Amino acid sequence: EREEDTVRYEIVNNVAWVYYNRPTKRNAQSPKLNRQMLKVLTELEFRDDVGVLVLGGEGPAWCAGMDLKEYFRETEAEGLAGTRKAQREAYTWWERLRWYQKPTIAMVHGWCFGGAYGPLFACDLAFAADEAQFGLSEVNWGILPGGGATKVAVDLMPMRVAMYHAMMGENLSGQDAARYNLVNESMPADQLKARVKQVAETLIQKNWATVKYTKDAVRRVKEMTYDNAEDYLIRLQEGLNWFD
Amino acid sequence: EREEDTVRYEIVNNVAWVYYNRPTKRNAQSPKLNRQMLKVLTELEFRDDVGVLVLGGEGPAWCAGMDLKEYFRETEAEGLAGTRKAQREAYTWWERLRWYQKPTIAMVHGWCFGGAYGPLFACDLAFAADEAQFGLSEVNWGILPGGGATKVAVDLMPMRVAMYHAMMGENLSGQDAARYNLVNESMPADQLKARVKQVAETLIQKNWATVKYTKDAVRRVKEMTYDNAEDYLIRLQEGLNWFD
Amino acid sequence: EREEDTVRYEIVNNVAWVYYNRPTKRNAQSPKLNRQMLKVLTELEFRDDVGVLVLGGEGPAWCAGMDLKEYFRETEAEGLAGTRKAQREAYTWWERLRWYQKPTIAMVHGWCFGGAYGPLFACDLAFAADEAQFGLSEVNWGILPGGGATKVAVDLMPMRVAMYHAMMGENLSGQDAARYNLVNESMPADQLKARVKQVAETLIQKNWATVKYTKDAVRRVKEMTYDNAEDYLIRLQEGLNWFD
Amino acid sequence: VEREEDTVRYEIVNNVAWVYYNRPTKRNAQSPKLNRQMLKVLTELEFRDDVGVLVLGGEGPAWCAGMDLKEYFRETEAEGLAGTRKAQREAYTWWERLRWYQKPTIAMVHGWCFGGAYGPLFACDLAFAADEAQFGLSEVNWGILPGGGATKVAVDLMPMRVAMYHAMMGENLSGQDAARYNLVNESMPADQLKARVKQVAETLIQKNWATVKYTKDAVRRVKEMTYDNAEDYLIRLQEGLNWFD
Amino acid sequence: VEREEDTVRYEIVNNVAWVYYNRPTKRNAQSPKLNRQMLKVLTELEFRDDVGVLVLGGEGPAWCAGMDLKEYFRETEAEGLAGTRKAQREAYTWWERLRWYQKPTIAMVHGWCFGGAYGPLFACDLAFAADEAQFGLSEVNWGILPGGGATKVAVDLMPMRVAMYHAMMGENLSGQDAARYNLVNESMPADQLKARVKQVAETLIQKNWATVKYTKDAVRRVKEMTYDNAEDYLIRLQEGLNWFD
Amino acid sequence: VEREEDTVRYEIVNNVAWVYYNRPTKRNAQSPKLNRQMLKVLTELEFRDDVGVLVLGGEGPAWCAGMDLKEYFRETEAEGLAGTRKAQREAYTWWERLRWYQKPTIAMVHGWCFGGAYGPLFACDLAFAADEAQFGLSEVNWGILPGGGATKVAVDLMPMRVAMYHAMMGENLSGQDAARYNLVNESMPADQLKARVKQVAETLIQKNWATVKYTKDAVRRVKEMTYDNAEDYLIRLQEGLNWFD
């Protein structure tokens, strides 16, 4: 119903705990959620009292993907202009999260499907419950994986695993997701919150500027030659010298 | 002896089971096999009753590599023209398989060596028997790995593993091959056929066009920046909308 | 004290065993060590009696990184010219090792931190003791990882692991380092020397030219498209035909 | 100049959107106000069925003198990082919108084009200059790097030597030199510019609009691909155009 | 035009293979028949010890007007995907053969060069045009993307602005404009073209054929490499040439 | 020519380092002796507070005829691989030093510039030629690939067709042709060259030296990046320049 209600958050000990807030719709990404998430992330980003952001979900799912009724079906009804506007709302918030000024953690307790892979990749670190499920079920509906999820699978997992994942549309458990490096770790659901809290409260004790430069450097040197990456990392250290 | 006899196949339940058919020569890739394999793959590719291709081998080996007598030794005897013609016959069928219209599965029950790595990579998915052996033994004969196998090792396995594999020329078991993501899975030899059959018969139940677009997208976004891969995957979905 | 004493070596059975030799300073890379290491590596490289190089360390550490007193602190005291001269001394020896004419093995028995990642990556193969520790603790001192270590973590380990490694500054054990393919293998410390000796004495029995071409090809095809890598590997084999 | 909505003007005539920078007394410098209004104007026009081509011009004697130093660079680091990052995003976002615009785009450069103007200059598909136009990256003289990705604009459009002199020396190129080094398509006397741009925009609106979009996007994209990858990509583009038509 | 083997002609004179497109009444449009015969002709000639250089010319007033719409685009989607993919492969395969040819290659472009002709134009190492030659990508006017990777050909050879106008506007370049924007090496009056191409082909056959091959391949390859990677690659190329000689 | 320290000369006048190749009777061919001395000279000058710009010229009628065949190619494979690799490293290392020099660099090319001279030519940020200067890659005539990464130099500076003819045919370009194909910035009569180079070097020393360094490095670097990655990179460069100033 109300756009302002699709996303919730709490600041606790300098950690922004941000939640998808459509628990009855498996936290599907509707245009309303896409606009509100950009709004929340934008307002939190440069707060001097927010050192780390955690992205979680209300109810049994983390994020079941794009809301096919509001996002794919209802949008296309107003044509190209509608499709493009709704596309831009989803892509721009995934990008703002991916390049966030503060370190970002995905806390993935349940369903993570399709167009949820964008936000999953946009989080620097990711912790799953064993009972979480990760899947690209789009092949079974006759479409390509949502929201660049193919590129997410290829940049995080071994090529053979990404290929099976996309082609067969079967789910990975929390443990399998960790094993194939889609996420950092898997643990029982009742341990997840405390491990994430511990990771978040460790990062806020570091120099926040250093953590930003260091996480951007990992993402960036992935797309350079070794020889270009060496010169780049020196140029980044020079810029870090100026922020600090 | 006869070029037409170097390759065998059977269509069963819309699956093309294609076999290397030189069981007494460990299914080594001779110029004759290279020309016949292109011929079979070309004729099967666009059949409306062929939804998936499986590449297997007769006898104890999957493929022991290039046939040094027919392919390397006897060819060089007619010089550059001979070398180039024989090279093109091997590379062009690996490429036709790698970009095949239908999904492709390697069913690897035994020896997979050297220039077999091209066909192995060209198959979208790969299942091995535990008793299978994978190796790049070329370093021990004083040459570089056959048929782009160095690039196959680097695109599928962790750099440190690819380096050992190439430099030491030792074999990986079925289990090791799975562990380092050269293949999707390893299982006892007496379970292999049934697992592959199950995978193949699952894919033919999907939209064949979607599976094609989805497998090409995995291979392609491996060689793009994240930002270019996002725009590309939208352009692919537009093309899929037209095939279907 | 004496620049000539910062590095030690022994030739045994055509293997150059090269050691960092500042055991009391955890083999930290000082400008003196950087100049002497280039000198030793340069003199050993083209010896017809040296078939493989092993890089080890005296005392409890392999290499704790850059010597903050001599390399970072004392250098900056003579400004840009001093910083640049000291940078070039470290980068040029890592590069000479990375492209070494002979195969290179890292024998890592203990601490491997920060700017040690350059030399670690520059070794083609790497074997660790279980009791070894690998870390990028720089985030905790407010700086980026030393000496391109970010790019080393990204080229060897899964992206999610590299990200945690850089951001949290926690150590990986020998076993974890092997599991995430920072090194080839981990084993108890009392087995390390004998495994490395065995690997080294296996490589010197191969055609030394072939091993060189084969190790350079792994490093190079990592930064090419599959289609460019195929043509390149043929051009390399043509050059190998000429050396031999 | 001072109310946000006045900082940009447009008219649509015969399916051509004529968009003008509208801070003529400030030589059309890109202030945060102009950056926000330009995005809103380009966004509203992009998908209209009655807009076939967009022309980007400027009021007064400048096309665009670059970024408004007083509002965009100062009154922003006033609010620290958060203000710098917001003003940066407003500028980079509308250049990106124009660069990947649904409709073909034309720069009509009659006068001064400096610094951060190079982003919009490159974001236009085609560009036509007056002989009396002047193009420059004077930022080296102010002790800073060229604004708004302009170094990359000079490297993608001009020969490397020319780009190198352009960045290092901070000297101006005439309209004729900008045509010669392919910063723009053509240069002509100022009194002929509008008639030539009008003729190009009218030629484009007669073509299949969806074909023009796929074809202009193809040129931009295959610049960053290997030949072998570009061959496949262009086939995939044609299949999407088949659907979109 | 109608029997497959008649669709291409050649003569070898003084170690120069003079290959001509031979559908002059169809302005040498690339039909599946011509595509298959061209591969067979280029394949037979490539490794002859008596062929030092290949010149690609055309009979009649066209070099190549592009793809044969009637045979290559229609009578192929007649057989659905399988026919489209077979006709595509026949065209792309012989362009690739010519692009990586063992011997140096020269385009001799006297007349019309349009659309899918750009693939063979780029596959030639060198190109010499008549002043009266015309180069164009008119596909935008027919509602389709340029045929046969031609967008990439225009982007790799010409400045981006020029490539952009070329694709979007579908207007022709004269021989003189094609030389100016480096689509071709040189343009000259039609009555001088053959004598100039002959002089270049004769200059090349006096050089070390293996050296010419490694050197032309090096130019093509280092275009897609970083400077630092190109430095190593060129050393590795010299070591292969040492062996091959 | 014969004592190592005599193989290079320089003077520093008004914060310009004028460095000259000094084997005039050997047309300034790059021998191992010259390669070692050039590194030592460039290394000593780079970080002086009184050196704002470096000009690389040559004594006698040549700028640089390329590598010294007699010392660099022979008397090196005399010592097998170890000698080849040492002489190679001496040449490639000082070209790299000049290419990434702390101060701006200018080639002053009055005469012959051939082969392995192309590495230093490209390593200079700017280049000014005499009309009577001659640029060539004649290595094809000697049966070898162009020396010292020169193929890559021709591909990064000139249009691909021009680079292809240059490598394959081994013919010379005049100073005027080298300016036209953007191998150099400008060509002028030999009696004007020194005054023009002096004027450029004096213009650069008035600018903020740290700004010139970041800006010239930006041009070189964003050539090997996507547009989207270049936009972020240039922001990161500005933040480093903020610190370094």
From TrEMBL, chains A, B, C:
Binding residues annotated for acetyl-CoA, in chain numbering: 25-26, 64, 66-68, 115, 137, 141
GO molecular function, one term: lyase activity
Keyword annotations of the record: Lyase
Pfam families for this protein: ECH_1 (PF00378)
InterPro entries, sorted: ClpP/crotonase-like_dom_sf, Enoyl-CoA_hydra/iso, Enoyl-CoA_Hydratase/Isomerase
Family annotation (CDD domains): crotonase-like (cd06558)
Alphabetized Gene3D superfamilies for the sequence: 2-enoyl-CoA Hydratase, Chain A, domain 1, 6.10.250.2850
Positions annotated to bind CoA: 25-26, 64, 66-69, 115, 137
UniProt record similarity statement: Belongs to the enoyl-CoA hydratase/isomerase family.
The name this protein goes by in its record: Feruloyl-CoA hydratase/lyase
Source species taxonomy: Bacteria, Pseudomonadati, Pseudomonadota, Alphaproteobacteria, Sphingomonadales
From TrEMBL, chains D, E, F:
GO MF, one annotated term: lyase activity
Signal sequence extent: none
Binding site for CoA: 26-27, 65, 67-70, 116, 138
PANTHER family linked to this entry: ENOYL-COA HYDRATASE (PTHR42964), POLYKETIDE BIOSYNTHESIS ENOYL-COA HYDRATASE PKSH-RELATED (PTHR42964:SF1)
Pfam families: ECH_1 (PF00378)
Keywords assigned: Lyase
Assigned protein family: Belongs to the enoyl-CoA hydratase/isomerase family.
Protein name from the UniProt record: Feruloyl-CoA hydratase/lyase
BP GO terms, sorted: isoprenoid catabolic process
Annotated binding of acetyl-CoA, by residue: 26-27, 65, 67-69, 116, 138, 142
Coiled-coil portions: none
InterPro entries xrefs: ClpP/crotonase-like_dom_sf, Enoyl-CoA_hydra/iso, Enoyl-CoA_Hydratase/Isomerase
